[PDB]
Design a protein around this nucleic acid. Structure first.
Lengths: 268, 270
RNA sequence: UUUUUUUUUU
RNA sequence: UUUUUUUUU
């Protein structure tokens, strides 16, 4: 099995200039009994270094706990999800950041730094990242993870009511909520059992479709629909880029055909 | 920075149930000499434990190297990016992942394990994952990091071209390439410099727009086009989901109404 | 052409 | 031959 850690380990597990006990560290353990104590929890993750921001709603059997690093936590979940524990089996996963903001239409020269500079005005930041492609050039979209949920909510309103921008040439930042998901651990078969009918569905083994069946043509149609679904979206995207890609330059006709007209009248 | 104890250390960075020297460990180092040796390259990541498959295109001043954990590479990349080295500053960042597939229209029953159980037939797989929401459930959307590009390629071919399915109730799997991006290290000002005009743009500082113009006005009109782009793509989705959502049932009538058709006809040879 | 800038193998 | 997992301050 996985060694639990060591004091050694703990500083290692700090992903390299990660701030400790980020919200990204907080973990939701659901499913705990009612008479679970404050220190009985905390004991469960004695294993995992000096705990932090810990909390329970005993009435619903659930609670939070921040650990040293996101790596460290992720092991926590690793080691703990589906622990039997007074009959119940604890369910651990990460807590829902919900302070997390996706941002788009960033110039290619927004640096991770500068994004935090900008948005640090709406409060304590936990992290601000500009995303990068396979060659590590900007992809116009970024992440701001906020300290407090007010801080986010205020950055949201402000930036989506008002017009926030970042560099000399003007591109409003478009601040939509980030929706979280896990591609790291995902869904194991472990806990894909304890749903209604794994078997009913999985009773037929992965396979290719018979070049004739109903079940083939059904698919080949559904596919077809989807290929189309794409074609449409792909066209909307193309329509609309073409649409921004035009604008900047016919905008510079509000300042170039509006004076081109008004010039020789006054001092003549 | 630059870590005090290792070896005793590395194993601990490995990940949980990470296959080590996965392609997600593969580092691109670009920007190096004519005259780098192989030896010299590996000696570079001496620090970082047993080196994996490594490779230099001396002809183009770049090479690759796999390290034990994604974890550990991350570090090397960090300790090493921009290292001056006979005239140049080497570039370390993660190499590209050809051999990474996105899958879709995934049964909500499809388990991480099962996913690779299926795909393993096109080649060894490095990992496969069902993505899950905040409430850890299927997003009908997976990932299958493969062995090699051939593997991912035959996997792709055989799934666009054929009709692969995974559970009993027929949902084709939609393999497409999955394109690669870094929500992690991202883009530091560090090297945000070394493009032509950082300043030109950064000259103006992060601000609101002037409730008059002009930058304001161009910006709310850009905002318009956008909310509109949304509306459109929002609809394409609801439209075509309707289309599909229909199909399950409106197909169950090529198989009952073309079949309760052909029973009564021959029932009159009198 | 000092270099950042191209370059991401079967 | 034991229990909140469409419940996340």
């Amino acid at each position: 099995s996985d060694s639990e850690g060591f004091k050694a380990n703990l500083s290692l597990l700090r992903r390299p200039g990660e701030k400790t006990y980020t919200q990204r560290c907080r973990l939701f353990v659901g499913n705990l009994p009612a008479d679970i104590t404050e220190d009985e929890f905390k004991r469960l993750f004695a294993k995992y270094g000096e705990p932090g921001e810990v909390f329970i709603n005993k009435g619903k059997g659930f609670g939070f706990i921040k650990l040293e690093s996101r790596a460290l936590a992720e092991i926590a979940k690793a080691e703990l999800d589906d622990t039997p524990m007074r009959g119940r089996q604890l369910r651990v996963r990460f807590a829902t950041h919900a302070a997390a903001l996706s941002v788009r239409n960033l110039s290619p020269y927004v640096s991770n730094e500068l994004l935090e500079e900008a948005f640090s005005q709406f409060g304590p930041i936990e992290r601000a990242v500009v995303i990068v492609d396979d060659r590590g050039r900007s992809t116009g979209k970024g992440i701001v993870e906020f300290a407090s949920k007010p801080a986010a909510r205020k950055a949201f309103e402000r930036c989506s009511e008002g017009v926030f921008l970042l560099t000399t040439t003007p591109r409003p930042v478009i601040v939509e909520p980030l929706e979280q998901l896990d591609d790291e651990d995902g869904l194991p078969e472990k806990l894909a059992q304890k749903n209604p009918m794994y078997q009913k569905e999985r009773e037929t083994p992965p396979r290719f479709a018979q070049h004739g069946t109903f079940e083939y043509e059904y698919s080949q149609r559904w596919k077809s629909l989807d290929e189309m679904e794409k074609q449409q979206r792909e066209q909307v995207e193309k329509n609309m880029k073409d649409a921004k890609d035009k604008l900047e330059s016919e905008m510079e006709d509000a300042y170039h055909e509006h004076q081109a007209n008004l010039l020789r009248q006054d001092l003549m």
